[PDB]
Write a protein that binds this ligand. Structure first.
Ligand SMILES: [Mg+2]
Ligand SMILES: [Mg+2]
Lengths: 128, 128
Protein backbone atom coordinates (compact mmCIF):
# COMPACT_ATOMS: atom_id res chain seq x y z
CA UNK A 1 0.00 0.00 0.00
CA UNK A 2 0.81 3.71 -0.09
CA UNK A 3 1.61 6.52 2.33
CA UNK A 4 1.21 10.27 1.91
CA UNK A 5 4.01 12.67 0.88
CA UNK A 6 6.56 13.07 3.69
CA UNK A 7 5.12 10.13 5.65
CA UNK A 8 7.32 7.05 6.24
CA UNK A 9 6.06 3.56 5.48
CA UNK A 10 6.87 0.90 7.99
CA UNK A 11 5.07 -2.32 9.02
CA UNK A 12 1.30 -1.93 9.25
CA UNK A 13 1.29 1.88 9.01
CA UNK A 14 2.50 5.25 7.79
CA UNK A 15 4.26 7.58 10.23
CA UNK A 16 5.00 11.29 10.14
CA UNK A 17 7.94 12.59 12.11
CA UNK A 18 6.74 16.16 12.74
CA UNK A 19 9.84 18.30 13.36
CA UNK A 20 7.78 21.17 14.67
CA UNK A 21 7.30 22.26 18.27
CA UNK A 22 3.88 21.82 19.85
CA UNK A 23 2.20 20.91 23.12
CA UNK A 24 1.04 17.31 23.48
CA UNK A 25 -2.49 18.74 23.13
CA UNK A 26 -1.57 20.55 19.89
CA UNK A 27 0.42 17.52 18.67
CA UNK A 28 -2.76 15.43 19.25
CA UNK A 29 -4.91 17.87 17.23
CA UNK A 30 -2.40 18.06 14.39
CA UNK A 31 -2.27 14.29 13.87
CA UNK A 32 -6.01 14.03 13.96
CA UNK A 33 -6.40 16.96 11.54
CA UNK A 34 -4.51 14.68 9.15
CA UNK A 35 -6.78 11.64 9.71
CA UNK A 36 -4.36 10.09 12.19
CA UNK A 37 -3.46 9.84 15.87
CA UNK A 38 -0.39 10.17 18.05
CA UNK A 39 2.03 7.24 17.73
CA UNK A 40 0.87 4.04 19.35
CA UNK A 41 3.80 1.72 20.05
CA UNK A 42 2.10 -1.66 19.95
CA UNK A 43 5.07 -4.02 20.30
CA UNK A 44 8.88 -4.32 20.27
CA UNK A 45 9.06 -4.60 16.45
CA UNK A 46 7.43 -1.23 16.09
CA UNK A 47 9.54 0.25 18.95
CA UNK A 48 12.69 -0.83 17.17
CA UNK A 49 11.75 1.03 13.95
CA UNK A 50 10.71 4.13 15.96
CA UNK A 51 13.86 4.02 18.06
CA UNK A 52 16.07 3.80 14.91
CA UNK A 53 14.66 7.26 13.91
CA UNK A 54 14.40 8.84 17.38
CA UNK A 55 17.97 7.87 18.26
CA UNK A 56 19.29 9.50 15.06
CA UNK A 57 17.36 12.65 16.00
CA UNK A 58 18.66 13.05 19.59
CA UNK A 59 18.40 16.90 19.64
CA UNK A 60 14.63 16.42 19.61
CA UNK A 61 12.13 14.59 21.78
CA UNK A 62 8.87 13.30 20.27
CA UNK A 63 5.45 13.29 21.92
CA UNK A 64 3.63 10.00 21.61
CA UNK A 65 -0.01 9.00 22.04
CA UNK A 66 0.40 7.82 25.63
CA UNK A 67 -1.27 9.82 28.49
CA UNK A 68 -3.25 9.73 31.74
CA UNK A 69 -6.08 11.89 33.15
CA UNK A 70 -4.17 12.51 36.38
CA UNK A 71 -1.09 11.42 38.32
CA UNK A 72 -2.70 8.53 40.18
CA UNK A 73 -4.27 7.37 36.90
CA UNK A 74 -3.33 4.55 34.52
CA UNK A 75 -1.52 5.35 31.26
CA UNK A 76 -3.61 4.91 28.08
CA UNK A 77 -3.05 5.07 24.33
CA UNK A 78 -5.12 7.42 22.15
CA UNK A 79 -7.77 4.79 21.22
CA UNK A 80 -8.33 4.39 24.98
CA UNK A 81 -6.52 1.05 24.89
CA UNK A 82 -4.67 0.21 28.09
CA UNK A 83 -0.89 0.46 28.34
CA UNK A 84 1.45 -2.50 28.54
CA UNK A 85 5.16 -2.33 29.37
CA UNK A 86 5.65 -4.77 26.46
CA UNK A 87 8.03 -2.42 24.55
CA UNK A 88 9.21 0.21 27.04
CA UNK A 89 8.52 1.48 30.53
CA UNK A 90 7.73 5.16 31.21
CA UNK A 91 10.61 6.88 32.99
CA UNK A 92 9.39 9.27 35.62
CA UNK A 93 11.08 12.58 34.67
CA UNK A 94 9.48 14.64 37.50
CA UNK A 95 12.29 16.55 39.33
CA UNK A 96 10.35 17.02 42.57
CA UNK A 97 6.63 17.10 43.35
CA UNK A 98 4.09 17.28 40.45
CA UNK A 99 0.52 16.47 39.35
CA UNK A 100 1.24 17.70 35.83
CA UNK A 101 3.50 15.06 34.26
CA UNK A 102 0.64 13.33 32.44
CA UNK A 103 1.85 13.10 28.85
CA UNK A 104 4.56 10.89 27.32
CA UNK A 105 7.37 11.60 24.86
CA UNK A 106 10.20 9.51 23.40
CA UNK A 107 13.78 10.73 23.47
CA UNK A 108 16.50 8.54 21.93
CA UNK A 109 15.72 5.04 23.19
CA UNK A 110 13.83 6.19 26.32
CA UNK A 111 10.30 7.17 27.19
CA UNK A 112 9.52 9.90 29.73
CA UNK A 113 6.47 11.58 31.25
CA UNK A 114 6.40 15.39 30.83
CA UNK A 115 4.08 18.36 31.38
CA UNK A 116 1.40 18.26 28.68
CA UNK A 117 1.61 21.93 27.65
CA UNK A 118 5.39 21.55 27.09
CA UNK A 119 6.79 22.14 23.61
CA UNK A 120 8.13 19.13 21.71
CA UNK A 121 8.20 17.39 18.36
CA UNK A 122 5.78 14.59 17.64
CA UNK A 123 5.07 11.39 15.69
CA UNK A 124 1.75 10.68 14.02
CA UNK A 125 0.58 7.23 12.98
CA UNK A 126 -1.93 6.16 10.37
CA UNK A 127 -2.79 2.47 9.93
CA UNK A 128 -2.60 0.99 6.43
CA UNK B 1 24.97 8.85 14.73
CA UNK B 2 22.50 11.57 13.77
CA UNK B 3 20.65 12.75 10.71
CA UNK B 4 19.31 16.21 9.92
CA UNK B 5 15.64 16.87 10.80
CA UNK B 6 13.30 15.52 8.10
CA UNK B 7 16.03 13.10 6.89
CA UNK B 8 16.00 9.37 7.70
CA UNK B 9 18.82 7.12 8.90
CA UNK B 10 19.35 3.70 7.31
CA UNK B 11 22.51 1.62 6.98
CA UNK B 12 25.57 3.86 6.58
CA UNK B 13 23.68 6.96 5.34
CA UNK B 14 21.14 9.75 5.89
CA UNK B 15 18.47 10.09 3.17
CA UNK B 16 16.19 12.94 2.17
CA UNK B 17 13.06 11.90 0.27
CA UNK B 18 12.23 15.23 -1.30
CA UNK B 19 8.57 15.60 -2.19
CA UNK B 20 9.04 18.59 -4.43
CA UNK B 21 9.29 18.77 -8.21
CA UNK B 22 12.55 19.54 -9.97
CA UNK B 23 14.56 18.69 -13.05
CA UNK B 24 17.34 16.17 -12.50
CA UNK B 25 19.68 19.18 -12.64
CA UNK B 26 17.91 21.14 -9.89
CA UNK B 27 17.52 17.96 -7.83
CA UNK B 28 21.31 17.56 -8.14
CA UNK B 29 22.01 21.14 -7.08
CA UNK B 30 19.39 20.91 -4.25
CA UNK B 31 21.17 17.83 -2.82
CA UNK B 32 24.65 19.41 -3.10
CA UNK B 33 23.50 22.55 -1.33
CA UNK B 34 22.55 20.36 1.63
CA UNK B 35 26.06 18.87 1.69
CA UNK B 36 24.59 15.74 0.07
CA UNK B 37 24.31 14.16 -3.35
CA UNK B 38 21.57 12.49 -5.36
CA UNK B 39 20.95 8.92 -4.18
CA UNK B 40 23.64 6.39 -5.04
CA UNK B 41 22.41 2.77 -4.89
CA UNK B 42 25.40 0.64 -3.85
CA UNK B 43 23.67 -2.72 -3.27
CA UNK B 44 20.50 -4.80 -2.84
CA UNK B 45 20.13 -4.14 0.89
CA UNK B 46 20.17 -0.41 0.16
CA UNK B 47 17.94 -0.85 -2.90
CA UNK B 48 15.42 -2.75 -0.76
CA UNK B 49 15.28 0.07 1.80
CA UNK B 50 14.75 2.70 -0.90
CA UNK B 51 12.15 0.58 -2.72
CA UNK B 52 10.25 0.09 0.56
CA UNK B 53 9.71 3.87 0.41
CA UNK B 54 9.27 4.45 -3.32
CA UNK B 55 6.75 1.64 -3.65
CA UNK B 56 4.46 3.31 -1.15
CA UNK B 57 4.77 6.64 -2.95
CA UNK B 58 3.89 5.54 -6.53
CA UNK B 59 1.93 8.70 -7.52
CA UNK B 60 5.37 10.05 -8.51
CA UNK B 61 8.95 9.20 -9.41
CA UNK B 62 12.25 9.98 -7.67
CA UNK B 63 15.41 11.25 -9.40
CA UNK B 64 18.63 9.50 -8.34
CA UNK B 65 22.36 10.00 -8.99
CA UNK B 66 22.49 8.02 -12.19
CA UNK B 67 22.85 9.61 -15.63
CA UNK B 68 24.96 9.45 -18.79
CA UNK B 69 26.59 12.02 -21.09
CA UNK B 70 25.27 10.76 -24.44
CA UNK B 71 22.58 8.27 -25.48
CA UNK B 72 25.14 5.60 -26.53
CA UNK B 73 27.28 5.99 -23.40
CA UNK B 74 27.59 4.20 -20.03
CA UNK B 75 25.67 5.08 -16.87
CA UNK B 76 27.58 6.69 -14.03
CA UNK B 77 26.83 7.74 -10.45
CA UNK B 78 27.38 11.34 -9.30
CA UNK B 79 30.80 10.47 -7.82
CA UNK B 80 31.77 9.47 -11.41
CA UNK B 81 31.62 5.84 -10.34
CA UNK B 82 30.67 3.11 -12.81
CA UNK B 83 27.18 1.61 -12.95
CA UNK B 84 27.04 -2.15 -12.54
CA UNK B 85 23.70 -3.97 -12.49
CA UNK B 86 24.21 -5.60 -9.05
CA UNK B 87 20.96 -4.17 -7.62
CA UNK B 88 18.73 -3.17 -10.53
CA UNK B 89 18.75 -2.88 -14.29
CA UNK B 90 17.63 0.37 -15.94
CA UNK B 91 14.35 -0.19 -17.74
CA UNK B 92 14.09 1.45 -21.12
CA UNK B 93 10.43 2.39 -21.50
CA UNK B 94 11.13 4.94 -24.27
CA UNK B 95 8.19 5.02 -26.75
CA UNK B 96 9.99 6.74 -29.67
CA UNK B 97 13.42 7.90 -30.93
CA UNK B 98 15.33 10.01 -28.42
CA UNK B 99 18.86 11.22 -27.70
CA UNK B 100 17.68 12.70 -24.40
CA UNK B 101 16.55 10.03 -21.91
CA UNK B 102 19.87 10.42 -20.09
CA UNK B 103 18.91 10.72 -16.41
CA UNK B 104 17.59 7.96 -14.11
CA UNK B 105 14.71 7.97 -11.63
CA UNK B 106 12.96 5.30 -9.52
CA UNK B 107 9.23 4.94 -9.93
CA UNK B 108 7.50 2.45 -7.57
CA UNK B 109 9.78 -0.62 -7.58
CA UNK B 110 11.43 -0.07 -10.99
CA UNK B 111 14.26 2.11 -12.32
CA UNK B 112 13.80 4.11 -15.61
CA UNK B 113 15.82 6.42 -17.82
CA UNK B 114 14.06 9.71 -18.65
CA UNK B 115 14.56 13.19 -20.07
CA UNK B 116 16.62 15.19 -17.57
CA UNK B 117 14.66 18.46 -17.46
CA UNK B 118 11.50 16.54 -16.50
CA UNK B 119 10.00 17.49 -13.13
CA UNK B 120 9.71 14.79 -10.46
CA UNK B 121 10.63 14.13 -6.86
CA UNK B 122 14.15 13.25 -5.71
CA UNK B 123 16.23 11.45 -3.11
CA UNK B 124 19.32 12.92 -1.52
CA UNK B 125 21.84 10.73 0.28
CA UNK B 126 24.53 11.69 2.83
CA UNK B 127 27.02 8.99 4.01
CA UNK B 128 27.74 8.59 7.71
MG1 LIG C 1 1.30 1.36 16.20
MG1 LIG D 1 24.33 4.66 -1.29
Amino acid sequence: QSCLPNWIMHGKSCYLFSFSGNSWYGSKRHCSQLGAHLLKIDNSKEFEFIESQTSSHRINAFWIGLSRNQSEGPWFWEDGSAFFPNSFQVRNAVPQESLLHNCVWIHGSEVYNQICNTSSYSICEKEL
